[PDB]
């Protein structure tokens, strides 16, 4: 029981007061993209970054004259040396096109 | 309580809670190799028996 043209005067007062968009005609202004908050930085941190390892453990205490073997890497090298022993190593990397 | 889960923790932002299972592997590796530190044969003047 109140004119619509009269209610807009109140709706417009709130917009001027609270600083909101006054769009009585429902025009597509793309403002829904402006209100949507970014989500890039939340997704970029998904995979943990490379951090301290045994190499940084050896370099930290290496100044004091302390050593420690890398059972993972020392085993990898031991395996490669075994292959080359029985003629099973990798071929020579080719650096040119096949021709 | 510390004997039910390896990480006794609660946080309101779970970003500090999802990587713990992976870190446990990395931390345990550091501790294992940390306690295996040994002097270099040249520091103690020990003659290394290479083999």
């Amino acid at each position: 029981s109140v004119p619509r043209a009269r209610l807009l005067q109140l709706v417009k007062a709130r917009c001027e007061l609270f600083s909101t968009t006054f769009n009585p005609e429902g025009i597509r202004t793309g403002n829904k993209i402006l209100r949507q908050r970014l989500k890039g930085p939340a997704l970029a941190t998904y995979y943990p970054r490379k951090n301290v390892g045994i190499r940084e453990l050896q370099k930290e205490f290496g100044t004091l004259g302390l050593e420690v073997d890398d059972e993972v890497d020392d085993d990898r090298l031991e395996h490669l040396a075994a292959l080359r022993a029985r003629d099973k190593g990798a071929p020579k990397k080719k650096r040119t096109a096949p021709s | 309580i510390s004997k039910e889960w390896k990480n006794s923790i609660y946080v309101f932002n779970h970003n500090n809670l999802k990587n713990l299972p992976l870190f446990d592997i990395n931390i345990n590796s550091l501790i294992k190799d940390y306690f295996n530190l040994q002097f270099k044969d040249k520091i103690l003047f020990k003659k290394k028996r290479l083999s």
Binding site: L77 | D41, K42, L50
Partner: peptide
């Protein structure tokens, strides 16, 4: 470089 060889030069003189 290449196939690694053992670092035989490791000793401390008295």
């Amino acid at each position: 470089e290449g196939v690694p060889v053992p670092k035989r030069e490791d000793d401390a003189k008295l």
